[PDB]
């Protein structure tokens, strides 16, 4: 897993009403000049709650990992995840937690 | 300075018209439940562009550092920075960059 044991413990594979997805985000070389999480917060009215991160600035660009929760309506959440991927941020929904 | 060499090179101590603050954020036990950066994006119409981050999760809360640029109008970035400080995120303006 190499997520925190607290999350190993509460994570549920199956969605459930007003669950919240726990995400693993992977940056693969974006410029810092792309404000992707700040844009999703306004555009999709979601909150991206950072759990942890190992984000490296290497070669003048961004390569690394973040664990987050994404809070918002189900439609907004799905749209934000897809838009992140459409900008080549890899996104894995690791499972779902409460609220 | 202890930031990436290209930022060290570009960093100005004096604020200039349309400059961009380069921030260091230090997390010292903020809960994962507080959507600090997402809320500033909406509240103050700024972008928090992550440069790098080494953030750990422990006991339900967060510890570590992030380097960012903050983009927005002068009054908006001033208000977002003041609000993060008001909410006890340790913020340091390392200097200013184009553009």
From Swiss-Prot, chains A, B:
- Residues reported in the UniProt entry to bind L-methionine: 32-37, 49-50
Q: Which GO terms describe its biological process?
A: D-methionine transmembrane transport; methionine import across plasma membrane
> Which superkingdom heads the taxonomic lineage of this protein's source?
Bacteria
Q: Name one GO cellular component term.
A: ATP-binding cassette (ABC) transporter complex, substrate-binding subunit-containing
Q: Which UniProt keywords apply?
A: Allosteric enzyme, Amino-acid transport, ATP-binding, Cell inner membrane, Cell membrane, Membrane, Nucleotide-binding, Translocase, Transport
What do we know about what induces or represses this protein's expression? Repressed by MetJ.
List localization entries: Cell inner membrane
Query: Which cysteine pairs are covalently linked by disulfides here?
Result: none
**Annotated segments matching region C2 domain:** 19-97
What molecular function does GO assign, one term?
L-methionine transmembrane transporter activity
Protein purpose: Part of the ABC transporter complex MetNIQ involved in methionine import. Responsible for energy coupling to the transport system. It has also been shown to be involved in formyl-L-methionine transport.
Q: Report quaternary structure and partners.
A: The complex is composed of two ATP-binding proteins (MetN), two transmembrane proteins (MetI) and a solute-binding protein (MetQ).
Q: According to its UniProt record, which protein family does this protein belong to?
A: Belongs to the ABC transporter superfamily. Methionine importer (TC 3.A.1.24) family.
**What is the UniProt domain comment for this protein?**
Contains a regulatory C-terminal extension (C2) with a ferredoxin-like fold. The C2 domains from each MetN subunit in a transporter dimerize to form an eight-stranded beta sheet.
* Name used for this protein in its record: Methionine import ATP-binding protein MetN
Name of the gene:
metN
* Shown stretch of the complete protein: 247 to 343 of 343
